[PDB]
Homo-oligomer: A and B are copies of this chain.
């Protein structure tokens, strides 16, 4: 593992455990047992590290919500889209906790973030249309875009909702699965009779994980 990649992963872990705002590049270097000069060789400031993390976030997002080509339309395919919701919230939780402030202070990062959000929305609408063609969902064509955008809003803001509903300042995997189960509920209401059985197996799988 290249030192540059070690710096990116240590940063992500520290930001996820303690909040991005309180971690300095000197703390990151001490965590890796390197000089702050050694860190500067690879990254000149903290923003540049956060920019590389956003890129990692963005490529996983585009791949996790990509439309399906020749895959068979079965349970394993559906779980993969639900697994990508969980992964993104948990692996980049420092981001969801403080998105507005990170975007407001870096215009380059914000512009790239918006391009990806629009491309993820377009893929999601395609996925939903395919599930309709394949007999998994019943939705009026004119509402598929709205459903996709509403689910995207749930996943993106679930963490902030949880942080503002209690006196506890940390996110547990259990909090995240509660969120997936709310999305799974919404989708269950749009399912076809032929496909209700599968939504009950997804529900049982996620109640069992936590």
A163 touches B114 (CB 8 A): no
Q: How large is the interface on A (under 10, 10 to 19, 20 to 34, 35 or more residues)?
A: 20 to 34
What is the CB-to-nearest-CB distance from A138 to chain B, in angstroms, rounded to a whole number?
10
A146 contacts the other chain (CB 8 A): yes
Binds B, one of A58-66, A81-89, A183-191: A183-191
In the complex, what residues of B have CB within 8 A of residue A186's CB?
150, 186, 189
What is the CB-to-nearest-CB distance from A193 to chain B, in angstroms, rounded to a whole number?
15
A160 touches B114 (CB 8 A): no
A36 contacts the other chain (CB 8 A): no
A148-165 to B contact mask, C-beta < 8 Å, 1/0? 011001101110110111
A164-184 to B contact mask, C-beta < 8 Å, 1/0? 111100000000000001100
Count of this chain's copies in the oligomeric assembly: 2
B164 touches A154 (CB 8 A): no
A182 touches B114 (CB 8 A): no
What is the CB-to-nearest-CB distance from A160 to chain B, in angstroms, rounded to a whole number?
6
| Cα distance A79–B38 in the bound complex, in angstroms | 62
| Cα distance A165–B121 in the bound complex, in angstroms | 11
Which of chain B's residues has its CB closest to A186's CB?
Answer: B186
A48-89 to B contact mask, C-beta < 8 Å, 1/0? 000000000000000000000000000000000000000000
* 17 sample A-B contacts, Cβ–Cβ < 8 Å, listed by A number: A100-B160, A100-B163, A103-B164, A114-B167, A117-B165, A143-B185, A146-B182, A146-B185, A149-B182, A150-B185, A153-B158, A153-B161, A157-B157, A157-B160, A160-B160, A186-B186, A189-B189
